[PDB]
Enzyme design. Sequence first.
Site, mmCIF file in Angstrom:
data_model
loop_
_atom_site.group_PDB
_atom_site.id
_atom_site.type_symbol
_atom_site.label_atom_id
_atom_site.label_comp_id
_atom_site.label_asym_id
_atom_site.label_seq_id
_atom_site.Cartn_x
_atom_site.Cartn_y
_atom_site.Cartn_z
ATOM 1 N N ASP A 1 -30.545 -14.697 -12.310
ATOM 2 C CA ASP A 1 -30.255 -15.674 -13.341
ATOM 3 C C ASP A 1 -28.875 -16.267 -13.078
ATOM 4 O OD1 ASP A 1 -31.318 -16.736 -16.009
ATOM 5 O OD2 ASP A 1 -29.321 -16.054 -16.573
ATOM 6 N N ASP B 1 -28.946 -11.091 -17.269
ATOM 7 C CA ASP B 1 -28.601 -10.688 -18.622
ATOM 8 C C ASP B 1 -29.139 -11.713 -19.604
ATOM 9 O OD1 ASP B 1 -26.797 -12.658 -17.829
ATOM 10 O OD2 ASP B 1 -25.086 -11.747 -18.822
HETATM 11 F F1 BEF Z 1 -28.045 -14.548 -17.574
HETATM 12 BE BE1 BEF Z 1 -28.630 -15.466 -18.960
HETATM 13 F F2 BEF Z 1 -27.514 -16.417 -19.933
HETATM 14 F F3 BEF Z 1 -30.340 -15.423 -19.377
HETATM 15 MG MG LIG Z 2 -30.153 -18.020 -17.253
#
Ligand code: BEF
Ligand SMILES: [Mg+2]
EC number: 7.6.2.1
Lengths: 362, 1172
Positions: free
Chosen positions: B402, B865
């Site tokens: 992510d 996260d």
């Molecule tokens: F790492 Be994230 F803001 F879904």
């Molecule tokens: Mg993200």
Amino acid sequence: NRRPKEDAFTQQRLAAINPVLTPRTVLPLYLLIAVVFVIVGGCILAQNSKVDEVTIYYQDCMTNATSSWSDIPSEHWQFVFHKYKTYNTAPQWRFVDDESDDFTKQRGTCQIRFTTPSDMKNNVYLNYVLEKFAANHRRYVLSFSEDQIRGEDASYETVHDATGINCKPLSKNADGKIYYPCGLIANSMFNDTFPLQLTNVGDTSNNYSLTNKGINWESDKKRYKKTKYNYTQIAPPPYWEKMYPDGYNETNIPDIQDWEEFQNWMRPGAFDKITKLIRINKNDTLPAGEYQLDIGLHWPVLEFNGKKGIYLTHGSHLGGRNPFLGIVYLIGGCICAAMALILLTFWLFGGRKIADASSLSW
Amino acid sequence: LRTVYYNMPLPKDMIDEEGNPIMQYPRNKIRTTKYTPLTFLPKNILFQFHNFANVYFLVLIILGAFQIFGVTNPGLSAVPLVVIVIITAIKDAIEDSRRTVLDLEVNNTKTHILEGVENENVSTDCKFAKNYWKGVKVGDIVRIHNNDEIPADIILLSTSDTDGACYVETKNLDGETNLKVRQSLKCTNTIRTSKDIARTKFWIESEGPHSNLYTYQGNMKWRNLADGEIRNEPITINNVLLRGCTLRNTKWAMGVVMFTGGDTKIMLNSGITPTKKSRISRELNFSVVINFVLLFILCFVSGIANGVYYDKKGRSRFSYEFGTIAGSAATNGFVSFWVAVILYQSLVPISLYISVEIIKTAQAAFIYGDVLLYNAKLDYPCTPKSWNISDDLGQVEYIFSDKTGTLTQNVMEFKKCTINGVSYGRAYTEALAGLRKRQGIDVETEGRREKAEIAKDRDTMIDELRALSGNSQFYPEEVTFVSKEFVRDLKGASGEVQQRCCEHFMLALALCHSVLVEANPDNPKKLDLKAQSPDEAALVATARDVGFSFVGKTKKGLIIEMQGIQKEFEILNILEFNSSRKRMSCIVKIPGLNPGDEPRALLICKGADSIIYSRLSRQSGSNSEAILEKTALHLEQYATEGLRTLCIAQRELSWSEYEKWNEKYDIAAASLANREDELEVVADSIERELILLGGTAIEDRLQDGVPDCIELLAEAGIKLWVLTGDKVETAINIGFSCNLLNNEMELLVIKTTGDDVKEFGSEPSEIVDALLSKYLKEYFNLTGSEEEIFEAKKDHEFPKGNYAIVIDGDALKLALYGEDIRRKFLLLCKNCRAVLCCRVSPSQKAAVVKLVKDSLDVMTLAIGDGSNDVAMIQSADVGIGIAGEEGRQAVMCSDYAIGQFRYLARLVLVHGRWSYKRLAEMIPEFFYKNMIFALALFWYGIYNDFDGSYLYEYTYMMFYNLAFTSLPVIFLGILDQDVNDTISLVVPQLYRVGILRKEWNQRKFLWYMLDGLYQSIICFFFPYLVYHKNMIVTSNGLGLDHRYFVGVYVTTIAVISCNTYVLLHQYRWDWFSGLFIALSCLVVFAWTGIWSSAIASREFFKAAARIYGAPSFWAVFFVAVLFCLLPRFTYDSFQKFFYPTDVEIVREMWQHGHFDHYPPGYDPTDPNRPKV
Ligand code: BEF
Ligand SMILES: [Mg+2]
Ligand SMILES: CCCCCCCCCCCCCCCCCC(=O)O[C@H](COC(=O)CCCCCCCCCCCCCCC)COP(=O)(O)OCC[N+](C)(C)C
Ligand SMILES: CCCCCCCCCCCCCCCCCC(=O)O[C@H](COC(=O)CCCCCCCCCCCCCCC)COP(=O)(O)OCC[N+](C)(C)C
Ligand SMILES: *[C@@H]1O[C@H](CO)[C@@H](O[C@@H]2O[C@H](CO)[C@@H](O[C@@H]3O[C@H](CO)[C@@H](O)[C@H](O)[C@@H]3O)[C@H](O)[C@H]2NC(C)=O)[C@H](O)[C@H]1NC(C)=O
């Protein structure tokens, strides 16, 4: 706080060596192992070749031997003497019928006259060998009573109903007197009466004495203990019923603590060949002469085509005459010396550098 | 379809008694756990019985409990299986009890629920009393305060702000770094206090929980007071607070609870935490089947050879044994078959699944307890949560990262700006793309920026109220010079038009914004900036630091402390930023220089650079076209550094033309034509001729060693695919700042155009949705292949092709629909050097992982996260959560939990690469170790006619796999290191043997089965050939010919040759494993020295006195340990000289001092690391 403890065990930083197998360290490891194992095997074969032995199979003595002194056929006897390697003076053998025995499957006396050209040293072992008698099936080797070995008047439900080791086929007879040495191991004890001397043929009062004491380990008397049954409680085993025709009196119940020929049979042989010590002399050299064995024949072998014999020897520290250990140390040297040579001559003519054969940076 | 009633009794749809409602909504509890406490025992036992040897041991207890075969103690042989199932289940419950203590933190964190009666309750004043998070029920009224997370899906009723507006932080639902505006309903907009909400009766007619983050449908019906009538009011997605969100810049927000538990969108876009059997653990079942075949062959051979003996004739069984029945057995090879099954049952060992699980649990304990994976700021060590997949971290080929919060730090910094074609701004952000040619000795420039910040702080000391310190000043540029003022004269203002441009640029950054003003309760003389976007928070704060302190807002305009004096600017109009506009514009009022005049009006437009250069004036005679080459050069130089750029453009208006523009602006304001395009044209009509003031550049900060971590992972052959929740251009800038886009790549942007998903019709021909299959084929001629992915999964290169995929999420929905387009989408992504997937749902993050995991046969990682990353974490093979100051769902649902992203190099390249090689070595060492012992029970079968007697005394068979051999295998699986932990990071290319799967094969297993088959011939027939001639092996002729004494010969050769085989296949002979290899070698002499002094030995009574005192024991011992170890020590020495692996060559350099100039615990992904 929650910072983990830094003590070089939890951080996986224990002191270590990290051995790297370079040919400057591995190729002298082969030559050291090869030189060791050809000096060891060279000294084993030197001490093994000096082991003399006398093996005479006598299972055909009732039929292939008569009441006169005839030679044993070479099928039955083997002599090894290192100072006389061309020795072929065959032992003679004679059969005395003993018609008052009335067993007719194995009876009488086989009289074996062997000749030894060299003298066996101070400790002389008279073994008996048995071939094709299988003492290692899984029902045979578990059939005895551990309570009765330790000298206990065990009940019927502790000689027959025990968990792993029990006198299961041979527990008690028809009226109910339980067999004292019970199970298949003690029942099928080797019968043949060997003498307590070797009769020096051609001389008198020079008979080489033998004994049935010192025949097992001295430490086995802590386990084989004298029984506490009465004569009423026990009966002889169903194939011991000829040595004890009347059963057990108050005087003839055998003390298995002092009867070491029983204690050897209760240790069954691991393999198809069985060799158990039955006479010993720890005192005197057996001189080079013609001696006589007088075997009371009672033990049947010919219904299973099995052999039955005698192994007279003075062994070595490795025990017996077996050429295996000296040959296989010399093979272990000549392999470790050959593959030290093959990897070295591949190294001087192939070979690489110790730095940059890595496939990442080609 | 649920209808949530409030402050009103339910209708007659309450037919369920013993608890009045029917629908039975879930409770507001998170699970994040593998097992619930009810079905722990049924589900964990089946997880242990999916291992094939565990249903092999269960059959041996069933068959051994029958008196046909005569198994001694049939109830004691179940004790080794039962205690291993209990110990593994106690371990799995302690592992699962640590996921429940994070549940109890989440289910107890103090929300505020109104104390009114809720008629959607189970059976088994009016204040906002503090209640628990798990106490939230469907129909509650919850007041959410400032800065705390939101308990459930909340249809928003009221706010502290008038007209009912919120701000939520959707970086937990999405990657959106900007605050989203959530409007409350205009019906219940005046409901302020707790006494007002108790007297309000309504109900909500809603829809089902449908897992789409961007859509909601609902109706609020409330019966009108003083007029009996139902009044519907529609509810959509911007009237809704979701569970991942956090309320920002608002004192309170009140609302109805609608979806609790698994009904919320972050739970519906996730699943139950899977149990995740590892790949080496899954492929271990096939190696057990190889043993089930070898067991079947040995029992079939012994079953037919026993029956051939039982119909012979001249055998001593007939005379001395009482099996005198010459018949009774023609082929009794069924009862003699399964006697050997009990005899050979230790060929698949009971200690298999308990040894490999002590390995995995203790490998998780050393990941947990190192200080280099410890995060000192959060006070947080690396927390393994799945204690059985440490070996999966050594085979990882694809990482699905992510972006927001995972790659980024959620801190924006104003770093550079252009004012009239002059570059103002100094930053050493990612000039370390030059690690090929020039050194990393440029820590001298980070001090050269640092002294320039202090020299700028000492130079900006003019009268500024909130020039607080350098701690809020993140724009180092010593060229802040107000040059040729206060030197020559007092008035000045003849030359230096650049100084007039610098102070008007920074004035425009303190005018064109929507940043509000709130007083900091710590030090109330200093107030801070409560913005919506963190871009505008960094623009207003950096104008505050250079002299233009925005100190408040009035209803007439803005109070701006322009270098001490608080000059007032009258705001005339505000044009709010929008997604369709990409622009924010502010009309300010120039004051009057001639008295009696109404002065002019200045338009200040800011927005994206690509659409403001369209809106510039082409009819000029000033320097309005020669500076356009200089600024557009800089904004290309800024975007390739990874900075968000933003042009600042203006036009002075005559105040009569502005009143003509205001005359049309009030037309588009008094009507409700905001959904229509009437207002956006009136704003467009004034924004056409513009003079460029310049541009800005804002750094979205990464975490500490993010471009260094991706550099090490890419050298290990690991591929990074950033899967992103927010906009396309945001992840492209993070692509350039993380060195994923390189400035010479060809971005293969997919970019679908039509709003039509392949869901209905258009079967024979299409015109608007064959585009995606078209340029998937068109990009498949520069990558000159069509569809062959069978050839592709034989390839594990990076690649070298300098392309990059940017797919936009909506086009990802159509590239993941059919089988033939998935194959072309995978083949293009596999052939590109960077994959960016933007505006991606939580479902599609899991879909990209499942596409790569199922089509290619590969190992995936999926760090993130945020609750949009949970499904990606759960659907991958490993799942990493990044921990923060708060409690995160992506941490609780993960398998490991690291504090920063840069710990992923230490986690994967050190611990996983070890835990792969520790367990790919140990498992063939384990089946070798058993079968060197269990096959001598077969080779003894030749010499007792396969009748079924035991070679070994019964305490050797218990204690072989328990005491004499169990510890060298276990301390190889826990503590073996091929190289040091620094060398694992200095040389990342050692990781590639796990991607190529060169350390664990079923071919490697068979050679250890063949090296195990060979040495049992050595371990049996070497004691056989010293007995075979005349059965005398003792120096005193007394006879060791018992079969238990031959088993002492065989066992002692087998134990020493095993424990020195395990020693030679360890790298890193340390003192701990070296001590416990020796104590395993010396416990075989010690146990029989103790057990064969007892009268309970029963056949074995003086075995150690008689055998160990025999010289033929110590002659067989050294020659048979030679021939066991000699064919493998020769093959390895031939292997290590002529075909060395990479990790044998790196160890050769490490002995020669090629790595000694690195400190212990050297971390290449560390900003505060020393010099090498
Ligand atoms: F790492 Be994230 F803001 F879904
Ligand atoms: Mg993200
Ligand atoms: C049927 C009869 C049963 C009788 C009883 C059986 C045995 C019971 C034994 C008692 C319980 C033992 C519990 C040991 C716990 C070890 C794990 C541990 O401490 O932390 C773990 C560490 O987890 C890891 O990541 C490392 C892996 C754990 C390695 C050790 C596992 C030990 C327990 C499992 C096996 C025990 C033996 C079982 C034999 C039957 C959880 O971390 P945390 O941060 O969530 O912990 C909270 C930390 N504080 C408090 C600072 C915030
Ligand atoms: C150097 C000194 C060593 C001293 C002893 C140390 C022991 C350390 C053990 C560490 C764990 C490794 C072993 C796990 C259990 C193995 C169980 C095992 O194989 O022993 C069993 C013994 O059976 C029993 O009756 C005893 C049951 C004891 C069960 C012990 C479980 C131990 C679990 C330990 C968990 C915590 C570990 C902590 C870190 C090491 C026999 O199985 P086998 O395959 O060897 O033989 C089968 C043939 N028959 C049926 C005839 C017996
Ligand atoms: C060891 O010695 C004994 C005698 O010294 C050997 O003979 C065995 O003698 C017993 C009783 O004398 C025999 O039992 C009897 O068998 C006949 C015929 O089956 C039966 O009519 C009787 O009722 C009684 O059962 C026994 O058969 C006989 N052994 C054999 C193998 O025939 C004995 O053979 C020697 N060897 C062993 C292994 O005990």
